[PDB]
Amino acid sequence: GGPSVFLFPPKPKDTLMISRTPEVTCVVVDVSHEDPEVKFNWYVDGVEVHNAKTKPREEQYNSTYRVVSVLTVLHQDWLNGKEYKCKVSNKALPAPIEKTISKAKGQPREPQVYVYPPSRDELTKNQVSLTCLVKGFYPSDIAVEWESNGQPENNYKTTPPVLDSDGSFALVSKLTVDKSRWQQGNVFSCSVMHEALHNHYTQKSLSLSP
């Protein structure tokens, strides 16, 4: 019993793309009204930082509070495997609970990215399926998104990555588009962001030839 703590990594797009803002998130739940006092300490490979921000306690429908501290990280430190430990001390806690987290381990492997046009068979339908295969990648942390004419084309689902027969990961993203738009000759591109890619980024395109 007493309060519990969960420790969450940044989003992979946030670590990979230099303008974005990667954060590690330390969540405290089951904080009591009678002992609501929660202090956070943060450490990066065992050294303390003070740039974190702790949110005010928040009451849950279950009568306990939720406490959070968000610690923005340097993209480089996360990608280099630096260790992030959040320390939670609370009256109800005879001993501090410490969770640590860091990037997924393993030697990087550059994803191979392919796009696939719609089946001949599928053209009978009001919509068509553009397919993006990403395989050979390691670790599994990855972001895959679609767009057309610079604009997010968000009408898509993606398999979570799963292990292939050579020990790497693969996944497939499916964007659904109007056959007409496909027929209108519009270009669609698959965007892939992964630590192994140069610039962390590659985009592959397809369209119907005039």
Ligand X SMILES: *[C@@H]1O[C@H](CO[C@@H]2O[C@@H](C)[C@@H](O)[C@@H](O)[C@@H]2O)[C@@H](O[C@@H]2O[C@H](CO)[C@@H](O[C@@H]3O[C@H](CO[C@H]4O[C@H](CO)[C@@H](O)[C@H](O)[C@@H]4O[C@@H]4O[C@H](CO)[C@@H](O[C@@H]5O[C@H](CO)[C@H](O)[C@H](O)[C@H]5O)[C@H](O)[C@H]4NC(C)=O)[C@@H](O)[C@H](O)[C@@H]3O)[C@H](O)[C@H]2NC(C)=O)[C@H](O)[C@H]1NC(C)=O
Ligand Y SMILES: *[C@@H]1O[C@H](CO[C@@H]2O[C@@H](C)[C@@H](O)[C@@H](O)[C@@H]2O)[C@@H](O)[C@H](O)[C@H]1NC(C)=O
Report the interface residues with ligand Y, using CB under 6 A: 29-30, 60-62, 64
- 103 neighbors 78 (Cβ within 8 angstroms): yes
Find the binding residues for ligand X in span 180-199 (CB under 6 A). none
Find the binding residues for its own copies in span 133-152 (CB under 8 A). 133, 135
Asked whether position 59 contacts ligand X by CB under 6 A, the answer is no
Decide: helix, strand or coil at residue 78.
helix
Q: How far apart are CA 157 and CA 93, in angstroms?
A: 43
Q: How far apart are CA 89 and CA 127, in angstroms?
A: 55
Asked whether position 141 contacts ligand X by CB under 6 A, the answer is no
Quick one: 89 or 158, whose CB is closer to its own copies?
Answer: 158
| Smallest separation (angstroms) from ligand X to the CB of 75 | 12
Establish how many alpha carbons lie within 13 A of residue 70's alpha carbon, considering only the half-sphere containing its beta carbon. Answer: 7
Quick one: 40 or 156, whose CB is closer to ligand Y?
Answer: 40
- Piece of 63-71, 87-95, 97-105, 165-173 that binds its own copies (CB under 8 A): 165-173
Asked whether position 12 contacts ligand X by CB under 6 A, the answer is no
Quick one: 149 or 165, whose CB is closer to its own copies?
Answer: 165
| Smallest separation (angstroms) from its own copies to the CB of 145 | 16
Q: How far apart are CA 51 and CA 42, in angstroms?
A: 9
Whose structure tokens read 């001949």? 120
Chosen residue from 60, 100, 180, 205 binding ligand X by CB under 6 A? 60
Asked whether position 112 contacts its own copies by CB under 8 A, the answer is yes
Quick one: 43 or 114, whose CB is closer to ligand X?
Answer: 43
Q: How far apart are CA 119 and CA 131, in angstroms?
A: 10
Radius of gyration of the chain (CA): 22
Torsion of CA 116, 117, 120, 122, to 10 degrees: 100
> Considering CB under 6 A, how many residues would be counted as binding ligand X?
14
Decide: helix, strand or coil at residue 123.
helix
Question: Which residues of this protein are in contact with ligand X, per CB under 6 A?
Answer: 6, 8, 10-11, 23, 25, 27, 29-30, 60-62, 64, 66
